[PDB]
Amino acid sequence: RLKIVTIHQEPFVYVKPTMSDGTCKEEFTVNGDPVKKVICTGPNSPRHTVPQCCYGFCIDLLIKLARTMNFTYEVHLVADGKFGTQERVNNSNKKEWNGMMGELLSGQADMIVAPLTINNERAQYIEFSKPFKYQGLTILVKKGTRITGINDPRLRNPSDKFIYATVKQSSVDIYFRRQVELSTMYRHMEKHNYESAAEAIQAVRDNKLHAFIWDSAVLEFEASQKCDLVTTGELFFRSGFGIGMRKDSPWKQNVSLSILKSHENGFMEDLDKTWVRYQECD
Ligand SMILES: NC1(C(=O)O)CCC1
């Protein structure tokens, strides 16, 4: 049985408590079909790991992959709650990956099934399937806020009058560490970065964070569901999400094959109509 690691990230992965009896609430999609739910163990003050209910775009994809490739699995949420960047550890010069990247490389996971950004930095250590989704980075702000994009002066010439940030240890860090100007901006963001996307988004709603830089697939969904939040500027650092596996895995070819077929037969498009574009904000 493959150990699949994922992370809370609506609409790709929803995480909810189980019912008192340990089962998952029966729900239905916008089409009337049952929502497929899997048990995913992970962190819920003292930290506790417990069985929870997971569902969403990536869970449906996982279920399809498992059926197509005939494998069984067990899902768990990344222990440190991060996507993954490489940093020095234990105050030494030894570098290790944190987040889902670290769990895959350590063997705690055999496959990463989540909205994981494909980039050169990560590709040096793991293998990615071809993209199952094409997207990029954008910016989330409160309705009414005026910003041109990543080149806006309030971003390029930072001030305590307009606070912007991202989520720590994600591909946004990787991307910004590739340009001097962006590097400076990231150092400034570092003082405000959040632990999770959900917390940063809530901060924008509460007017505690003026701009949140993150994945457009996630931000456009959030903005489409909350009439008080909007995305702004042109997308930058276009990239795709892919399934992550260790180098020389026996699953890479078949995973990419399944993803290709899903892009060909409408399966991926159907996931978008089920989980991304289906209702107005409320
Ligand atoms: N998809 C992300 C990643 O780190 O994989 C980029 C924002 C989270």
Swiss-Prot record:
Modification after translation, per record: NMDA is probably regulated by C-terminal phosphorylation of an isoform of NR1 by PKC. Its phosphorylated state is influenced by the formation of the NMDAR-PPP2CB complex and the NMDAR channel activity.
Residues bearing attached sugar chains per UniProt: 44, 70, 90, 157, 254
Stated name of the protein: Glutamate receptor ionotropic, NMDA 1
Subunit structure: Heterotetramer; the NMDAR subunits are modular and harbor tiered domains that function in concert to regulate opening and closing of the cation-selective ion channel pore. Forms heterotetrameric channels composed of two GluN1/zeta subunits (GRIN1), and two identical GluN2/epsilon subunits (GRIN2A, GRIN2B, GRIN2C or GRIN2D) or GluN3 subunits (GRIN3A or GRIN3B) (in vitro). Can also form heterotetrameric channels that contain at least two GluN1 subunits and at least two different GluN2 subunits (or a combination of one GluN2 and one GluN3 subunits) (in vitro).
Top-level taxonomic group: Eukaryota
Domain note: A hydrophobic region that gives rise to the prediction of a transmembrane span does not cross the membrane, but is part of a discontinuously helical region that dips into the membrane and is probably part of the pore and of the selectivity filter.
Extracellular side: 146-282
Location of this chain's protein in the cell: Cell membrane; Postsynaptic cell membrane; Synaptic cell membrane; Postsynaptic density membrane
Tissue spec. comment: Detected throughout the brain, in brain cortex, cerebellum, thalamus and olfactory bulb.
Disulfide bridge map: 24-53, 40-54, 227-281
Binding site for glycine: 115, 117, 122, 171, 215
Family: Belongs to the glutamate-gated ion channel (TC 1.A.10.1) family. NR1/GRIN1 subfamily.
